[PDB]
Amino acid sequence: KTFEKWVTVAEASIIRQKTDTDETIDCMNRFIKMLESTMNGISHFPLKTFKSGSYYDRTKIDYNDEFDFMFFPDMKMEAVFTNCPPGYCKIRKGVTNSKDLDPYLNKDGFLVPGLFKQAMFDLFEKSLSDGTFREGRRTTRQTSKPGSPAYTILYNLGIHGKRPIDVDLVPAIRIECWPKPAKEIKPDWVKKETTERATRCFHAVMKTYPENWPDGDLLWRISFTHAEKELILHANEKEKGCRKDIFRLLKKIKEVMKSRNSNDIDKFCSYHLKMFMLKFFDKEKYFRNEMKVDLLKKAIKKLGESVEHGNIPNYFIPEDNVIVNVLEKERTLIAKELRALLEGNW
């Protein structure tokens, strides 16, 4: 047994999962289109959606990779960043004569996450039960983590041999600029126009800030889901090498590592890998297909070192440490497990 050997099997299994990919994306495209149409007949304010996840940015490693749909009011809003911890913001009304969100504003005019969450979750539940959405009968609510931005369901397509699709419904606010505290990214590995599209907007979602903070109940998480989607989807745009292959293999490594350590890796997730990966894409200039396995080795090594050091920067806001909440016991276990993979002991 070697690392190279484990990599070969990992690649074959990733490819095996690619069967029924196009058929699945069309079921899920129909799903979200009908759900949005049902929701816009119930909500007292119009909504739009944004679709993301590994099926849409083409880094899918398993049929059951999840689908993320954000739902956001179709009106102008504004994000504020003063007195906010890195990676978080507050939300207020922009230039808009709409009073549709007024009942979710506190005395000072801030959109209150827990009030807007409860209204959006109530809307989701009503829409998935509604009679104009025949697919909602195939849906059922799944447990999510406390404070999660997502209403998580299982969508049973009825495919024998395949478990239901994991779907996150994420209430969100769309802000149509780049966040003031965010780095002006200029990756050299996508075209200038792709970076232009990636930085067109961001979204704010109601992940609860986990630490003590005055008015912390007013904090929203800055979400770069749109920009992340643009850059990952188009990562082979210029060189056409193994950039997305290395990302896919790192996600597989994480999935197997979690399966090797049932409840001891509950915080490390693909989002942390994505932030790590984007920074690796900047540091590493060359990604020839023939370099694949060696660059994966160097990526595993820098990742282990990052996790041990305990800091992986948010690619768009470098002072946001996205693994701050990953505790030492888990970080120590991750690095030890990455060392054992490289040495052929998996």
Swiss-Prot record:
Cofactor or coenzyme needed: Mg(2+); Mn(2+)
Catalytic activity: UTP + ATP = 2',3'-cUAMP + 2 diphosphate
Keyword Nucleotide-binding: yes
Annotated EC: 2.7.7.-
GO biological process, alphabetically ordered: innate immune response
List of residues binding Mg(2+): E66, D68, D168
Keywords per UniProt: ATP-binding, DNA-binding, Immunity, Innate immunity, Magnesium, Manganese, Metal-binding, Nucleotide-binding, Nucleotidyltransferase, Transferase
Domain of life: Eukaryota
UniProt-recorded Gene Ontology molecular function terms: ATP binding; double-stranded DNA binding; metal ion binding; nucleotidyltransferase activity
Family: Belongs to the mab-21 family.
Role of this protein: Nucleotidyltransferase that catalyzes the formation of cyclic UMP-AMP (2',3'-cUAMP) from ATP and UTP and plays a key role in innate immunity. Acts as a key sensor of double-stranded DNA (dsDNA), the presence of dsDNA in the cytoplasm being a danger signal that triggers the immune responses. Directly binds dsDNA, activating the nucleotidyltransferase activity, leading to synthesis of 2',3'-cUAMP, a second messenger that binds to and activates Sting, thereby triggering the immune response via activation of the NF-kappa-B transcription factor.
The protein's name: Cyclic GMP-AMP synthase-like receptor 1
Organism: Crassostrea virginica
Upper lineage: Eukaryota, Metazoa, Spiralia, Lophotrochozoa, Mollusca
Shown part of the complete sequence: 288 to 633 of 633
